[PDB]
Write a protein that binds this ligand. Structure first.
Ligand SMILES: *[C@@H]1O[C@H](CO)[C@@H](O[C@@H]2O[C@H](CO)[C@@H](O)[C@H](O[C@H]3O[C@H](CO)[C@@H](O)[C@H](O)[C@@H]3O)[C@H]2NC(C)=O)[C@H](O)[C@H]1NC(C)=O
Ligand SMILES: *[C@@H]1O[C@H](CO)[C@@H](O[C@@H]2O[C@H](CO)[C@@H](O[C@H]3O[C@H](CO)[C@@H](O)[C@H](O)[C@@H]3O)[C@H](O)[C@H]2NC(C)=O)[C@H](O)[C@H]1NC(C)=O
Ligand SMILES: *[C@@H]1O[C@H](CO)[C@@H](O[C@@H]2O[C@H](CO)[C@@H](O)[C@H](O)[C@H]2NC(C)=O)[C@H](O)[C@H]1NC(C)=O
Ligand SMILES: *[C@@H]1O[C@H](CO)[C@@H](O)[C@H](O)[C@H]1NC(C)=O
Ligand SMILES: *[C@@H]1O[C@H](CO)[C@@H](O)[C@H](O)[C@H]1NC(C)=O
Ligand SMILES: *[C@@H]1O[C@H](CO)[C@@H](O)[C@H](O)[C@H]1NC(C)=O
Ligand SMILES: *[C@@H]1O[C@H](CO)[C@@H](O)[C@H](O)[C@H]1NC(C)=O
Ligand SMILES: *[C@@H]1O[C@H](CO)[C@@H](O)[C@H](O)[C@H]1NC(C)=O
Ligand SMILES: *[C@@H]1O[C@H](CO)[C@@H](O)[C@H](O)[C@H]1NC(C)=O
Ligand SMILES: *[C@@H]1O[C@H](CO)[C@@H](O)[C@H](O)[C@H]1NC(C)=O
Ligand SMILES: *[C@@H]1O[C@H](CO)[C@@H](O)[C@H](O)[C@H]1NC(C)=O
Length: 900
């Protein structure tokens, strides 16, 4: 039926070509109008996460009480030019060694450097920004000293306490070696036991646990350390753009300072939480020139290879501008609606629309070239008749592609969702502006060609032959079998080695050639002993103010054995398996060890009933919990809620402990209502060393396994609350937990669409379709085989290029399958030969441009992500699809093709 519409409308475009060029122009301008309007290129690195994914819902929950996870700037600083030294104690005998970085004159230099960094000036909003402004001080009143994780916080960042020495000039009863050896074993104390005194706390960045500052030490003896780790945590509050940016500026001066810092006594590594999203943007420039010159070669070929100085140069340029017009239109309307225009979309979309649109251009133009007008036939009748001969094919392919991509936007991997929207529309708009504006400006170049005026100013060429000779050899029953054998061999190969495909991005690979983050990843895998931290979160609803409520969560001292912190501790004994690193560091156990009557920590005034200090003189401040036998037991009743806010207001006092303001302040949520209640909580620990792309995934899986294992044991009946873990990266690496099923779903959905449209549209009869769909399945399976053979991973980028791949293979298989299915020659081999000579000779010119671009793409692409993912998968899709469409599909139709 469509033949009437495409014929009559083609005649229309030939008669009156003004209304269609002008109509289409109004369309284009109307969409590009929205282009520059929005053009919001998303870039926060949660674009790899789904807004409904359990990981991002968990993040949106953890942002309720601690808000965001802090930015982290780190330094692995090591001493290369200083040998070890030996500490011999005095009365007791137990010699200890001290590694290179633990020399004292070095620790002085580390202190001068850390003080220099501790105050760096930066300009934001035409103002001035200091570290103290933006780093988190766990006590906004009291001392606003900033958290700073170094071994030097054992010595309170002062050279006096470092050079402390107790003993006469000759012997040394207890120097800094003894203080260090004491703190690394109990870093939550305010009073050393060796000297008269000192404190193992610091400039109050909390109790400096020894694993976050030491590196390269063997096992438990930290003294054998070989590198110092220094961690500055800075606030993040993603919920704001004002101050996050000034933080980014402070880091921007920071990095330049550390890089331009000479100290031959030390070799340094470091990291700002923007360094990745910075050097990555740096690498996203090395290829741009190569991409543009690639498009110059494709454009140039398109201009040249058209027709037999009457070259259709202006026609090729025009069709190009129509394709670019289609891209700008799609990005336009979708921007208008509000679609974050990601970068991968900028790499894929113009390549796609350029390839397919160019193919349509060649089908049409070449179709007219091989046609010769009849006796008294007219231009309207001729170009209209050809437009009918071809149009339902271009509409078939482009339509199945559009519904395929659009239907592809159904998953939640956002990189493929945004893509499938943009492309799913851009293909359609390309077909509109292509069958309307392009053909109507094709009649113009026709009349110019027949009135002898030059194209730019004012038979059958070759590949018709080349395919009239290629088409017979390929399917003389002498050779048919051989071809089927080759393709079944390759397909069997890929079927075999598709399982051993690598899941996940190799973060060390994604960095520029000689960036600094590479040395940072290596120096992490070498020395470091702790990984990212995890916040085992207990949601609202737990009793807490009860025996069985505490024992379900409390740790040790009669607190079950399946309790939460007992679960994380037992899970930490096997660190290199259950990737849970170290001790859990609970609040409720410290609270219990704080209200304790034997402590003089908690005291309330006898007469104002207000909480007395731990350091105050207490004339009348009596103890919170009496020294009865029952009073020494944990606060079971509402007294729990009575004293808990005082603990979370209490501060480090040398007559008491670290108090709750230290770290459990921003950890315990006190819900106010019907008295009081305890909301959500967390138990901060640290993952083991995570380096491999499989490491992170294993850590997330096992951590959530601990979450569920605890949740069943908390005797809970229903989704009233769970115990999920949060970390920096669970958001980024939860997407790999379902990549298998999401890939299968998406490719099966695109295949279901293409098969449906090819079934119903291309008349009927399945076999016409099922042959095509099956051939596409071959294209994808062999594509996976290339991934394995060429070392290509299976992340969101490669997946996007797979969806696109199944997209463009339709441009090969579809026009051939149509040209075959609607034909009446004396043999099936005849129809396959013709369908391979007419359409095939044109599809092969919707190829050699993308191949002649795949050439130059490699020749200077520096980004190894580009060389590995985009170039290699592009090459595999073009050669693989082309061979599977112009070599295999004819032979297959020559035996199973339908008969008419
Ligand atoms: C890692 O740490 C352990 C312990 O801190 C180191 O073992 C110690 O090695 C040195 C010897 O070079 C000494 O500090 C100490 O041994 C002394 O005492 C005995 C007394 O009989 C004598 O036999 C010793 O070898 C030496 O005189 C060791 N201490 C212990 C507890 O074993 C170990 O060498 C360190 N390794 C590295 C690579 O630094
Ligand atoms: C899991 O944790 C450790 C992390 O890899 C792993 O390594 C052990 O600890 C250190 C390296 O961190 C090394 O142990 C060293 O101890 C002796 C002293 O007897 C030293 O002379 C040598 O350095 C020795 O290699 C080892 O590399 C290794 N082994 C031991 C015994 O400590 C642990 O092995 C892992 N443990 C478990 C239970 O999984
Ligand atoms: C953070 O606070 C502690 C105490 O609240 C500071 O320790 C004091 O340091 C200054 C020296 O510059 C003097 O007030 C005293 O020598 C210290 N007092 C005590 C009680 O130790 C610490 O210096 C502060 N942080 C920084 C970076 O100065
Ligand atoms: C550190 O370097 C300075 C100057 O290069 C030098 O004077 C000092 O001795 C070095 N430190 C040590 C422990 O040698
Ligand atoms: C930065 O502040 C530190 C103390 O916080 C001080 O020692 C240092 O001199 C300051 N830097 C400058 C350039 O004034
Ligand atoms: C920043 O603001 C001050 C006062 O508003 C002004 O004097 C100064 O010139 C500004 N900075 C620059 C670089 O102009
Ligand atoms: C540490 O404890 C000892 C023993 O009671 C005491 O003499 C000393 O003053 C304490 N240190 C501080 C800083 O109070
Ligand atoms: C807790 O104790 C029971 C027996 O009392 C034991 O079967 C169980 O395994 C223990 N918990 C763990 C985590 O092993
Ligand atoms: C309570 O203790 C804090 C910290 O130990 C101290 O700064 C404050 O002065 C004390 N309260 C009073 C009223 O002195
Ligand atoms: C507390 O007050 C009571 C009366 O309210 C008095 O009998 C008692 O001696 C006081 N004790 C202290 C330690 O102040
Ligand atoms: C985890 O759950 C299993 C049964 O689902 C239970 O037997 C076990 O005690 C729980 N705790 C562990 C394994 O620590």
């Amino acid at each position: 039926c469509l033949r009437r519409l495409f014929t009559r409308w083609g005649s229309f475009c030939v008669r009156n070509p003004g209304c269609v060029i002008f109509f289409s122009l109004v369309f284009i301008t109307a969409c590009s109008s929205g282009l520059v309007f929005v053009r919001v290129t998303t870039n926060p690195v949660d674009l790899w996460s789904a807004p409904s994914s359990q990981a991002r819902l968990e993040k949106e929950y953890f942002d309720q009480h601690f808000g965001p996870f802090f930015r982290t700037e780190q330094l692995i600083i090591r001493a290369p030019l200083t040998d070890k030294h030996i500490y011999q104690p005095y009365p007791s005998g137990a010699d200890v060694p001290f590694g290179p970085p633990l020399d004292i004159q070095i620790l002085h230099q580390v202190l001068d450097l850390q003080i220099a960094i501790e105050n760096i000036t930066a300009s934001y909003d035409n103002e001035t920004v200091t570290l103290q402004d933006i780093c988190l001080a766990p006590l906004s009143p009291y001392n606003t000293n900033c958290t700073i994780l170094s071994v030097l916080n054992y010595f309170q960042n002062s050279h006096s306490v470092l050079d402390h020495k107790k003993g006469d000039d000759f012997f040394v009863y207890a120097d800094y070696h003894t203080h260090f050896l004491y703190c690394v074993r109990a870093p939550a104390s305010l009073n050393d036991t060796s000297l008269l005194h000192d404190p193992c706390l610091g400039t109050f960045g909390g109790p400096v646990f020894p694993w976050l500052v030491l590196g390269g030490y063997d096992d438990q003896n930290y003294n054998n350390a070989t590198a110092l780790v220094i961690t500055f945590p800075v606030n993040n509050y993603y919920n704001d753009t004002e101050k996050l940016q000034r933080a980014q500026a402070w880091e921007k001066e920071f990095i330049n300072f550390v890089k331009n810092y000479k100290n031959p006594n030390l070799t340094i590594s470091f990291t700002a939480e923007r360094s990745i999203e910075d050097e990555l943007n740096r690498e996203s420039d090395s290829d741009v020139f190569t991409v543009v010159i690639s498009y110059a070669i494709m454009f140039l070929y398109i201009s040249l290879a058209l027709g037999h100085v009457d070259s259709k140069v202006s026609l090729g340029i025009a069709g190009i501008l129509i394709v670019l017009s289609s891209v700008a239109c799609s990005l336009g309307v979708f921007s208008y609606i509000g679609l974050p225009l990601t970068l991968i979309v900028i790499e894929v979309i113009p390549f796609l629309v350029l390839a397919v649109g160019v193919d349509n251009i060649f089908i049409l133009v070449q179709a007219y070239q091989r046609d010769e007008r009849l006796q008294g036939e007219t231009l309207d009748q001729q170009l209209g008749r050809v437009l009918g001969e071809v149009a339902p094919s271009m509409f078939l392919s482009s339509f199945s592609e559009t519904v395929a991509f659009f239907l592809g936007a159904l998953s939640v991997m956002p990189a493929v969702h945004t893509f499938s929207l943009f492309a799913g529309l851009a293909v359609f708009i390309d077909f509109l502006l292509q069958i309307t504006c392009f053909v109507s400006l094709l009649g113009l170049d026709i009349k110019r060609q027949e009135k002898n005026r030059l194209d730019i100013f004012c038979e059958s060429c070759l590949f018709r032959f080349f395919k009239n000779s290629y088409s017979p050899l390929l399917l003389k029953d002498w050779m048919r079998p051989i071809v089927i054998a080759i393709f079944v061999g390759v397909l069997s190969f890929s079927i075999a080695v598709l399982n051993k495909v690598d899941i996940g991005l190799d973060q060390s690979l994604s960095m520029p050639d000689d960036s600094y983050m590479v040395d940072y990843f290596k120096s992490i895998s070498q020395y470091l002993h702790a990984g990212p931290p995890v916040y085992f979160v207990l949601e609202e609803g737990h009793d807490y103010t009860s025996s069985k409520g505490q024992n379900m969560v409390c740790g040790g001292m009669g607190c079950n054995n399946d309790s939460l912190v007992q679960q994380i501790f037992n899970a930490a004994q096997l660190d290199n398996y259950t990737r849970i690193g170290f001790a859990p560091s609970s609040w409720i156990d410290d609270y219990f060890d704080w209200v304790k009557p034997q402590s003089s920590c908690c005291r309330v005034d006898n007469i104002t009933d207000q909480f007395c200090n731990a350091s105050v003189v207490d004339p009348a401040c009596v103890r919170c919990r009496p020294l009865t036998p029952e009073g020494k037991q944990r606060p079971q009743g509402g007294d729990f809620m009575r004293f808990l806010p005082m603990f979370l207001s209490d501060n480090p006092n040398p007559k008491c402990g670290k108090g709750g303001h230290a770290a459990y302040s921003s950890a315990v949520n006190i819900l106010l209502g019907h008295g009081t209640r305890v909301g959500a909580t967390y138990f901060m620990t640290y993952h083991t060393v995570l380096q491999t792309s499989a490491d992170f995934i294993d850590a997330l899986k096992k951590a959530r396994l601990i979450a569920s294992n605890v949740t069943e044991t908390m005797g809970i009946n229903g989704s009233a609350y769970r115990v999920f873990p949060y970390s920096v990266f669970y958001v980024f690496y939860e997407q790999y937990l379902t990549i298998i099923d999401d890939t299968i779903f998406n490719l099966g959905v695109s295949l279901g669409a293409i098969f449906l449209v090819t079934m119903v549209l291309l008349g009927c009869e399945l076999w016409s379709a099922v042959i095509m769909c099956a051939t596409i399945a071959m294209v994808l399976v062999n594509m996976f085989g290339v991934m394995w053979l060429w070392g290509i991973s299976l992340n969101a980028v490669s997946l996007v290029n797979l969806v696109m791949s199944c997209g463009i293979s339709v441009e090969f298989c579809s026009h051939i399958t149509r040209a075959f299915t609607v034909s009446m020659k004396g043999s099936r081999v005849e129809r396959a030969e013709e369908a391979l000579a007419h359409m095939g000779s044109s599809v092969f010119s919707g190829i050699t441009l993308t191949k002649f671009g795949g050439i130059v793409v490699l020749a200077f692409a520096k980004s190894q992500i580009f060389q590995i993912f985009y170039f290699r998968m592009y090459l595999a899709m073009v050669l693989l699809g082309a061979t599977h469409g112009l070599i295999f599909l004819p032979v297959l139709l020559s035996y199973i093709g339908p008969s008419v």
